[PDB]
Design a protein around this ligand. Structure first.
Ligand SMILES: [Ca+2]
Ligand SMILES: [Ca+2]
Ligand SMILES: [Mg+2]
Ligand SMILES: [Mg+2]
Lengths: 548, 548
């Protein structure tokens, strides 16, 4: 198989990971020094958050140059060395490619806002790089995404004298993909980094490329035709490189972003459908939404692979769930009204789960045993907290916590001078929650995560096998099998806070013994009708093999 | 029933819990300010380590005045306030009565060492307070307890020109109980504190009072005679007080320290038998040695109650295990030569268990679930570690860790000026392990412990009910029932590090429905022959009721 199907991904922001020089900002020398850490964790692929020049109004998804490195993070020489050094360790790196839009500080938009013709009468070729309107009445009734901050997707530019389209902040004017010059600019921006050795891109906000009257302005066929073109460009010029899509859509529209065997689009897509249902199931002590949504996902192409995750740099999004499912989630997980943003929740993993390590391990085992390639968010592997006193999703992006020294060892600069202030509270602070502490602890969450990744690495059915849910007779107990190359795994997970009793339909496996993956302990052989009774403690996870 | 059968005891050292006046030593006004912590923990009775004047060559078990208060700890008035404020909070208090020996600095031994007669001719009434020998050849080949320090149990005193007996330190000479004045002295001391409102005594080293030639000098019938007289005095003069025996002996001999219904001795004994078998069983994933040692414990009198503990202020002792059990416990629980002392391991409870919270919770539930009244060792409810730099057994007596402020909140003095230096290491140091942290932490070990005691409190059968071991067909799984007042609790626990299955013999309970004490989650009803299958995750504990 291709590499990305077997890979464990780790998402980090280069600005908040390791400061190498005391300026209070993470940089690429700093990241390079921590590469043995990520390797020893069992990570196979970094995914770097946007590293480009930018005024950082959206923390860098507002690109003011696609072919350079933000000064904060170092130089392009530093980047190249980091890339050389990760490859020397068998690490893959994928960047973030921001296609839909650019910063209003981009030179293109600085040109385009001057009018259709320049002060010397010649046409201004940059003007059609963006999406203009005389009055701003086109594409009405389409969703606003930053519902908390923006009142419209049209904002008047007082210089150019007319409106311009943006799905995100006013400072992020959308690019005009009906202009063929724009498509080739992003082909070329992609080409620039793939030539440098980068192994692929997470492409960002793909559903919103093209805008058409009379539609939702999402998942448009024309948009998919642009992405089919990216994949052709990459597959032709850079074999082996990965294209990963962020598609916050319902399952039927999400599988579209894989394309098909004839016309491929993305290699990999983020399984947003399942993610919120893992948290609803934990509070509802009931797993049936997981199976429901999981069966609403069609078979994807051979080249395709789901990308499972629990949290990320963003809010826990609640926009692709029902009105009932959403109200429940808010009540379960957003007691303070401040914890809500943009139809979602802005909390780190550990606070969501009340810091309960039994619950943290449960979800992460379901993360690693579900079909796809997992992606860890930076610092979740040690149980970091959030800082809601930071605006707009920034409270989950606080600096990594390496040790209990100055600023958590993220930087020699005092925490007040760190780009984001490292957390120092009594529950989640760096004096209590840090990597050094947990490397010396025999039983730390860090070492648990590494032990668990190693256990999954040993059983290729986790990455490549099929998935079949099993009847348990109890909505709190989720059970399924993964089948691959004549290994059958049995994953039985309790989602309740107390002991639960199941009855598993192991009819097809009569005369087989389930044995533990850990420690090889025999459980009774499946007999008779195949109905197999189990008791499970609170939040237990049984990782089992069915011998032949 | 007697109050102590309901009680939960907490074992603390006043020098070490909370300093009230910045001197670096804990005192009684410090302890008085922390009394609300203890009550809200769910603790009924305080056991204070010795608080008497003493040069502290054995941290206070070398007494220099039975009727005073060590200057470190405050005044006799400080003590009366504390006992008032403790009784006002529903807290019993028992002190440690060091009976077998005094300090060589005790007035008595200072007198006695002058010799049989005074310089002026008259006999020296104090000489025969201690045990003397002209040549130290008596009581030959008896055990030496402090094997690392003492080569003999006899020691030549320069001024008296002859040898004296000591079971413990040369600076802790044994008191001569064949002398009736010695008995009257200890009765007297007991009265002094029981007249101040103290609620009873731990009596220290009760097997070693009398020495008789041609015996082991342990558990002699003459020693029991004296202890009977103690019980008779307290029953007669101070009814309702508690007498607690620290008797590290085999099961056949420990039950003797209860006396008989006709002739009472102690109200309570420490279950030293079961203690090392708990740890042994964890590393072997095999619990037979626990059931076996318990099955050798004879029935005790009506008034009698076992005291179950996991750790305390002494090393984990292995004097009363076989020679092959001892060697096993050294390989498993003392990799470094520095962790042994005196036929035992000097480690705190969390380091012994590798700081694995699952194992820590498991053992604490078995503590609370076995017959008797449990005693917690201060700071194990938050996972304190040890400082093996410190000599003797001081590595388990570091100061309490209350917050992450100065010295862990123990003192306003610096760490280098505290009696024992508060632990500052990356794993267990007060930066990571402190009471303030765990009160704000929704899933801390402290909150688990208080919650786990509250559960026990609401099921009287743990304190009062009988014990019955259940066959599980799996050595890793320990099952037993507790019956009292028409409630039947069933306690299943997995001593293995991986999922285990068992086959319970619940045949006496056909038709009974098992539910969980927490939330009444239903398990299948017992039917047929009553062979009831279970599966368990690693280190699980099921606390079940068997509804009739
Ligand atoms: Ca667009
Ligand atoms: Ca003696
Ligand atoms: Mg820097
Ligand atoms: Mg003091």
């Amino acid at each position: 198989p291709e590499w990305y199907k077997s890979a464990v991904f780790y998402e980090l922001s280069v600005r908040t990971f390791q400061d190498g020089n005391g300026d209070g900002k993470g940089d690429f020398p700093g990241l390079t020094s921590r590469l043995d850490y990520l390797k020893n964790l069992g990570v196979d692929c970094l995914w770097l958050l946007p590293w480009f020049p930018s005024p950082l109004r959206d923390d860098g998804y507002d690109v003011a140059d696609y072919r350079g490195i933000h000064p904060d993070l170092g130089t392009l020489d530093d980047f190249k060395v980091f890339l050389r050094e990760a490859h020397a360790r068998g690490l893959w790196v994928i960047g973030d490619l921001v296609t839909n839009h650019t910063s209003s500080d981009h030179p293109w938009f600085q040109a385009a806002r001057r009018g259709p013709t320049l002060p010397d009468g010649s046409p201004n070729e940059y003007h059609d790089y963006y999406v203009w309107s005389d009055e701003g009445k086109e594409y009405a009734d389409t969703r606003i995404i930053f519902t908390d901050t923006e009142v419209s997707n049209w904002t008047l530019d007082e210089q150019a004298g007319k409106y311009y389209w943006h799905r995100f902040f006013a400072s992020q004017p959308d690019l005009n993909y009906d202009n063929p010059k724009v498509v080739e600019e992003l082909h070329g921006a992609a080409r620039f980094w793939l030539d440098l050795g980068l192994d692929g891109f997470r492409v960002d906000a793909v559903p919103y490329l093209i805008e058409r009257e009379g539609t939702s302005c999402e998942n448009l066929p024309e948009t998919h035709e642009i992405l089919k073109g990216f994949r052709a460009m990459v597959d032709r010029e850079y074999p082996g490189r990965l294209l990963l899509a962020e598609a916050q859509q319902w399952p039927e529209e999400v599988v579209e972003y894989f394309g098909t065997e004839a016309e491929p689009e993305f290699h990999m897509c983020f399984n947003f459908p399942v993610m919120p249902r893992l948290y609803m199931s934990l509070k509802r002590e009931d797993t049936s939404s997981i199976r429901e949504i999981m069966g609403r996902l069609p078979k994807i192409p051979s080249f395709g692979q789901w990308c499972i995750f629990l949290r990320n740099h963003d809010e826990l999004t609640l926009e692709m769930v029902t009105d009932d499912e959403r109200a429940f989630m808010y009540a379960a997980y957003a007691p303070d009204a401040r914890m809500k943003i943009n139809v979602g929740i802005r909390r780190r993993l550990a606070p969501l789960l009340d810091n309960d390590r039994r619950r943290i391990e449960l979800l992460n085992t379901v993360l690693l045993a579900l079909p796809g390639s997992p992606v860890l968010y930076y610092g979740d592997e040690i149980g970091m907290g959030d800082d809601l006193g930071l605006p707009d999703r920034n409270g989950v992006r606080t600096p990594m916590q390496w040790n209990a020294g100055t600023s958590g060892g993220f930087s020699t600069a005092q925490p007040s001078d760190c780009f984001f202030p490292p957390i120092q509270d009594p529950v989640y602070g760096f004096g209590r929650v840090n990597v050094q502490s947990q490397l010396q602890d025999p039983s730390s969450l860090l070492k648990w995560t590494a032990r668990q990744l190693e256990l999954r690495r040993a059983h290729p059915a986790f990455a490549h096998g099929d998935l079949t849910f099993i009847e348990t007779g109890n909505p709190a107990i989720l059970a399924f099998t993964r089948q691959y190359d004549g290994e059958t795994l049995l994953i039985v997970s309790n989602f309740a806070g107390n002991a639960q009793a199941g009855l598993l339909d192991l009819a097809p496996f009569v005369g087989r013994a389930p044995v533990t993956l850990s420690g090889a302990s025999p459980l009774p052989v499946v007999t008779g009708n195949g109905q197999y009774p189990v008791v499970m403690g609170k939040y237990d996870y049984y990782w089992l093999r069915l011998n032949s």
